[PDB]
């Protein structure tokens, strides 16, 4: 979508706030939001592309100024209700319970070794997105390509600052899960992936650096040929 999260090239967001140092997790709740990712993933709440789409449908002012891991909470709730796994009225009632009893205990539960096994496997083996396809790559290094002007409402990785722009293919990476189907519940439908180079003057007009370039990854349908 054309959401506010697609911030590349936006002005007026303010100076970078960068403490001289900071902890990994700034509060106990952040550890929780973090660990909830593997938990909802394994339970089938969503995958990576779908996860990102939930954050992209956030209220824009909240997205811009809330704590980062709060975005994760929002996307959890988004897909919990989407799949029917999270009953909102229950959730709201419990929030008011923990507002008023912030030290009340969590539900009694049994520890599950397979969830530790899951965590460890995912951290050290990863969740690789590369896939094999029957079709050969359409493009190749040196090809001059133009980025699609389509403006889908659903999930995609089509930053607005690159659309309709022309660049040169830098590398083909193989085929990978395709955000435009995956993020929208429509399967992996893998597509070839390429890095594409856009000069800053292509991107920003005369306001661009004459000695600078932006490298951006494009799935095959994003780009069409200009010159081979």
């Amino acid at each position: 979508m054309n959401g506010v999260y697609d911030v590349g090239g936006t002005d007026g967001l303010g100076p970078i706030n960068r403490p001289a140092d900071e902890p990994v997790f700034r509060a106990e709740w952040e550890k929780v939001a973090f660990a909830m990712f593997p938990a909802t993933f394994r339970a089938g709440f969503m995958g990576l592309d779908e996860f990102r789409f939930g954050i992209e449908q956030m209220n824009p002012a909240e997205y811009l100024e809330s704590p980062y891991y709060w975005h994760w909470i929002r996307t959890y709730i988004h897909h919990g209700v989407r799949t029917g796994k999270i009953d909102l009225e229950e959730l709201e009632r419990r929030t008011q319970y923990y507002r008023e009893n912030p030290d009340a205990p969590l539900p009694e539960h049994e520890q599950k070794p397979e969830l530790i096994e899951f965590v460890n496997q995912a951290v050290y083996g990863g969740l690789p997105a590369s896939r094999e396809v029957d079709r050969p790559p359409k493009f190749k290094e040196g090809d001059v390509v133009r980025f699609s002007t389509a403006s889908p409402k659903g999930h995609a990785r089509r930053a607005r600052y690159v659309r309709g722009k022309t660049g040169t293919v830098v590398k083909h990476h193989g085929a990978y899960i395709y955000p435009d189907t995956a993020g929208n519940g429509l399967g992996e439908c893998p597509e070839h992936l390429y890095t594409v180079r856009f000069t800053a003057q292509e991107l920003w007009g005369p306001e661009g650096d004459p000695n600078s370039s932006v490298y951006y990854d494009c799935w095959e349908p994003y780009i069409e040929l200009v010159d081979t």
Partner: protein, 203 residues
């Protein structure tokens, strides 16, 4: 920035806490989440995976030109040699800073970052100020924010990681470090230097 609409940081944190605890209680009752599962994720990224892992690769490439070749040809495979890899660095591409090229990395669309060599990103990398500006005014941004002055004649290449490919900068080895041990050289490698926002430490 000032927002006359915005509650106190205290009121915000207290509300978030109640909401997370309520959501946590529901996922616990579903059987999909446990306390030990939360501790283990937090232990891994507090104390196990961090930018010290990336420094080990950097000092290996600095001191082993054949490894440096393999790193730049296939970053995932090369890091696998040192027992480094996994979640969110399943596809790593390392890009070498030179006298003619400087590299800087961003995720304008979200917060993606090579976890197996840098750990979780600092907050400034995930936030809208860095992400919005670096693709547009990289040279001014590096000087103003990080005091890093890239001469106008040197090219800056900004890598916007929009895919699952993860870009990591290989910083130029500082002058004056001839014959240094790998341990000693690693002290010069920083998170900032493998993002592109700073060179490796001087001296």
């Amino acid at each position: 920035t000032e927002n006359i609409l915005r509650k106190s940081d205290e009121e915000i944190q207290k509300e978030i806490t109640a909401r997370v605890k309520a959501l946590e209680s529901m996922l616990i009752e579903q059987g999909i989440l446990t306390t030990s599962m939360i501790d283990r994720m937090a232990e891994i990224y507090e104390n196990e995976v961090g930018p010290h892992l990336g420094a080990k690769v950097v000092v290996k490439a600095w001191t082993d030109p054949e490894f440096k070749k393999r790193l730049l040809a296939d970053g995932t495979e090369a890091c696998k040699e040192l027992g480094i890899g996994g979640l969110q660095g399943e596809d790593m591409m390392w890009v070498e800073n030179t006298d003619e090229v400087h590299h800087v990395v961003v995720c304008t669309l979200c917060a993606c970052y090579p976890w197996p060599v840098l750990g979780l990103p600092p907050n400034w990398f995930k936030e809208p100020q860095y992400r919005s500006r670096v693709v547009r005014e990289p040279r001014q941004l590096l000087k103003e924010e990080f005091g890093f002055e890239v001469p106008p004649s040197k090219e800056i290449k900004v890598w916007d990681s929009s895919s699952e490919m993860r870009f990591v900068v290989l910083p130029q080895r500082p002058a004056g470090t001839d014959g240094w041990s790998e341990e000693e050289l690693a002290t010069l490698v920083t998170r900032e230097s493998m993002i592109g926002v700073e060179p490796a430490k001087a001296v």
